[PDB]
Design a binder for these strands. Structure first.
Length: 78
DNA sequence: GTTGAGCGTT
């Protein structure tokens, strides 16, 4: 019921990858990877919204090895 | 063709 920000994302990681990964925990409403609009190069972080809340809690309780690097899913500021 | 803590153009 709330967006989770994802930190530590590898540079090459794309939206659908993040989606693909996070889907293994449950249904994913949306996903975002923040990039420079001019180059498309990832800024290293993203966002994700889950349908179920229990799926959201689970994802925060642990770190995430995404494309070779440990990533953190935290509640965002503002 | 580069980097590595952070906080979201629509």
């Amino acid at each position: 019921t709330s967006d989770l920000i994802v930190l530590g994302l590898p540079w090459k990681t794309t939206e659908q990858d993040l989606k693909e990964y996070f889907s293994t925990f449950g249904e994913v409403l949306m996903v975002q990877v923040k990039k420079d609009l001019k180059t498309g190069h990832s800024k290293g972080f993203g966002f994700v919204r889950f349908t179920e809340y229990e799926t959201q809690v689970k994802v925060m309780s642990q770190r995430h090895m995404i494309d070779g690097r440990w990533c953190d899913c935290k509640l965002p500021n503002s």
